[PDB]
Ligand binder design. Structure first.
Ligand SMILES: C[C@@]1(c2nc3cccc(C(N)=O)c3[nH]2)CCCN1
Ligand SMILES: [Zn+2]
Length: 199
């Protein structure tokens, strides 16, 4: 389908060269996309659309929805139970939120844990070209997004806002990131199974 070619194109075209020289996510310029599955979870979709309507009403009739990537070792729990802010902690750059990227390669750095953890379960390699990885391509409601450049450890969205946008700066994020503080503000629409490819 054209729908899945659109997802593959977003995955491939948003890859960037990372500052860590590939330490966290591995060394690659492209992926080998193995499978793209649309997630159809009615209960999660209804939780998402209900919140999206509330946010839209609080943001001049505009949800400010974006399709963004999410990398996590807990993708299977997310598809079944949804995103859950109770699993987020204050330590992150923008505090206790759920983080998303517009660059697939940035989310890929989080698939095996913080900073890529110890890499794949079988070879303990953050740059494994063999093991199949999974990323989510999500529908995210940003609403009135608070624009921020430096670390700001929050527990919740800033007053009057529905999310935080981390914007690139000098010392300094390299790439954007988007943070929500309510799990119902995102829907895990596509599950992408892939490998990073050796350059
Ligand atoms: C390190 C962490 C993180 N930062 C991100 C920025 C953009 C995307 C993601 C993602 N999961 O795809 C990120 N995850 C996890 C919790 C504290 N912040
Ligand atoms: Zn491996």
């Amino acid at each position: 389908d054209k729908e899945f070619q659109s997802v593959e194109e977003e995955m491939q075209s948003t890859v960037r060269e990372h500052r860590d020289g590939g330490h966290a996510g591995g060394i690659f310029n492209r992926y080998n996309i193995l499978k793209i599955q649309k997630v159809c979870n009615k209960k999660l979709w209804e939780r998402y659309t209900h919140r999206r309507k509330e946010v839209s009403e609080e943001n001049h009739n505009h949800a400010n929805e974006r399709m963004l990537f999410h990398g996590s070792p807990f993708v299977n729990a997310i598809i079944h139970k949804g995103f859950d802010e109770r699993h987020a902690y204050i330590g992150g750059m923008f505090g206790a939120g759920i983080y998303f990227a517009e660059n697939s390669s940035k989310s890929n750095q989080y698939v095996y844990g913080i900073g890529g953890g110890t890499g794949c379960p079988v070879h303990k390699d953050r740059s494994c070209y063999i093991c199949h990885r999974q990323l989510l391509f999500c529908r995210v409601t940003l609403g009135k997004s608070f624009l921020q450049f430096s670390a700001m450890k929050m527990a919740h969205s800033p007053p009057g806002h529905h999310s935080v946008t981390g914007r690139p700066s000098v010392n300094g994020l390299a790439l954007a990131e988007y943070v929500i503080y309510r799990g119902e503000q995102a829907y895990p629409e596509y599950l992408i199974t892939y490998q990073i490819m050796r350059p």
